[PDB]
Amino acid sequence: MFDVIVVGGGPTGLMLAGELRLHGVRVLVLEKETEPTRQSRAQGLHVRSIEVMAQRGLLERFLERGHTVAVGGFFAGLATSWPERLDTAHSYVLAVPQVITEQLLAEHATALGAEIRRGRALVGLRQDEDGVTVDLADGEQLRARYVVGCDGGRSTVRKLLGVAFPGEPSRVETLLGEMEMTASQEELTSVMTEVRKTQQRFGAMPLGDGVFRVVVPAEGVAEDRTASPTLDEFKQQLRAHAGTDFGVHSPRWLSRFGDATRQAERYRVDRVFLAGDAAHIHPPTGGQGLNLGIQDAFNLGWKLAAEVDGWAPEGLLDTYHAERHPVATEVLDNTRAQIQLMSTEPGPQAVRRLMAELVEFENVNRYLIEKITAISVRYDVGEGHELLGRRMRDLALKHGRLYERMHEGRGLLLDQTGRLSVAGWEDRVDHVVEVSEELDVPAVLLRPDGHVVWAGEDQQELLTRMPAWFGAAT
Numbered sequence: 001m002f003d004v005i006v007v008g009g010g011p012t013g014l015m016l017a018g019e020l021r022l023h024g025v026r027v028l029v030l031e032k033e034t035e036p037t038r039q040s041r042a043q044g045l046h047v048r049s050i051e052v053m054a055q056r057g058l059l060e061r062f063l064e065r066g067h068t069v070a071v072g073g074f075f076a077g078l079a080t081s082w083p084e085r086l087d088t089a090h091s092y093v094l095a096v097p098q099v100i101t102e103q104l105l106a107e108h109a110t111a112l113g114a115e116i117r118r119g120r121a122l123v124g125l126r127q128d129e130d131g132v133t134v135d136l137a138d139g140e141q142l143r144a145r146y147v148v149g150c151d152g153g154r155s156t157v158r159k160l161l162g163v164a165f166p167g168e169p170s171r172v173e174t175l176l177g178e179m180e181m182t183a184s185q186e187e188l189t190s191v192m193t194e195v196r197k198t199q200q201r202f203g204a205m206p207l208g209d210g211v212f213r214v215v216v217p218a219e220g221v222a223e224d225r226t227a228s229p230t231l232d233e234f235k236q237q238l239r240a241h242a243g244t245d246f247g248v249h250s251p252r253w254l255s256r257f258g259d260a261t262r263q264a265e266r267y268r269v270d271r272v273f274l275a276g277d278a279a280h281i282h283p284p285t286g287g288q289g290l291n292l293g294i295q296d297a298f299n300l301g302w303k304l305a306a307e308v309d310g311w312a313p314e315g316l317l318d319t320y321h322a323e324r325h326p327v328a329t330e331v332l333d334n335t336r337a338q339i340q341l342m343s344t345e346p347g348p349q350a351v352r353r354l355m356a357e358l359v360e361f362e363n364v365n366r367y368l369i370e371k372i373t374a375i376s377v378r379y380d381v382g383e384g385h386e387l388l389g390r391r392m393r394d395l396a397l398k399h400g401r402l403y404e405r406m407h408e409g410r411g412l413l414l415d416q417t418g419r420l421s422v423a424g425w426e427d428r429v430d431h432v433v434e435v436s437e438e439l440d441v442p443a444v445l446l447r448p449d450g451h452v453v454w455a456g457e458d459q460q461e462l463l464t465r466m467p468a469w470f471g472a473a474t
């Protein structure tokens, strides 16, 4: 049998498979699609996702296949500028296609020793008090201690548990397409900016290889929710919302996505977990579905690997739902506000003009970017320092950065004075003694995902918060 079986070869399951392999966990990735989909969904990581890869040393391969972008207009298309005093060392946006993002995460999980069986489709599942039984379409049963559901928005695992999926349905659908056009490239650059003053969800971005990525609003709601949109439909929407069809060339692939904002009610149902789109779906327009799914698995990874090793605290796995469900609600809630600001009605247009006056303030622009990039996410840990909950930025230490010592996914203890020590938790927590100037506190205790659970200078105060997140001593 296996220790953990994840259901989904997407960027969420691959990120969870790598986090579990850092602790020697026999994992198994079940993916329905044999060949990975060539549909370029997302187009890059945000600041927090960039920091997540840096904590594992995966940032080099991402930066080799992409390029950094520091512009304005990521919040509801409000074309501004990038903030100045952004509390993060990776204050930029890496532009990598999701196909490359899934490719690097799959190669890293395979390099760490993860069974990725492509072509296996989960049909049914059931669980006892000792493990979970998985029934595949081919008829092969698989026993596992814990199973996590990363099988996308139409999650089969979620339906096999009764976990409700409440939220608002799809009301405003949009058309996306990677293509070229008979119109000049320089001519479209001057046309999009003029129409964007009213219809904000009309865009066009180049890919360098001669093709572009044009997103055009659609009319009505499609009843199939999976039917291939015709090319004549694409030009009819381009001529109605932009005044010119551009005469498109060869289209690589077309799609039509909705704006249904739904979120799972339970993230854990006793040995079965949900992550990524399996636990929350929201519109791609103002979306963090790739950033959220990565950070969801980045939160569950070290926690689930702590249970199979036997040192996890009592209700550690219960905190996955208690910490990643509110993050999905506020994200999903922000996506609705961003589409609302993109509405063409005279009401929402007046609110967008008010927001445009407020984003001129740097603190307002910084607050929105810190919330969108998810670098301001703060969990509930307890009472104490002002750092309790938030992650720790890449602090420049005396010898190298800070994220260069967290590759093994172990507990970190930044000790600037050296008088603090770990007694009995050496098997889970390291002891980095490096003086930093960006840190105004004597010592910080970091969870494997970077979030702070203790900050101070007392040894006895350290002895209080150590077993709360790392179990008892040896």
Ligand SMILES: Cc1cc2nc3c(=O)[nH]c(=O)nc-3n(C[C@H](O)[C@H](O)[C@H](O)COP(=O)(O)OP(=O)(O)OC[C@H]3O[C@@H](n4cnc5c(N)ncnc54)[C@H](O)[C@@H]3O)c2cc1C
Residues within 6 Å of the ligand: 007, 008, 009, 010, 011, 012, 013, 030, 031, 032, 033, 041, 042, 043, 044, 098, 120, 121, 122, 123, 150, 151, 152, 153, 154, 155, 156, 157, 176, 257, 275, 276, 277, 278, 284, 287, 288, 289, 290, 291, 292, 293
């Ligand atoms: C057009 C578009 C643009 C987007 N743009 C962005 C963006 O700019 N930024 C951003 O952050 N997010 C963006 N997103 C959202 C983000 O891409 C998704 O949320 C993300 O792909 C979901 O990650 P996941 O691995 O959890 O889901 P998936 O990638 O859907 O993973 C599910 C995988 O498991 C497989 N599977 C399904 N059911 C089963 C089963 N029963 N058994 C086995 N395997 C199964 C599926 O075939 C699939 O391969 C966009 C989404 C879309 C559609």
Ligand SMILES: [Cl-]
Residues within 6 Å of the ligand: 077, 078, 079, 197, 356
């Ligand atoms: Cl605007």
Ligand SMILES: [Cl-]
Residues within 6 Å of the ligand: none
């Ligand atoms: Cl760097």
Ligand SMILES: [Cl-]
Residues within 6 Å of the ligand: 357, 358, 360, 361
């Ligand atoms: Cl102003």
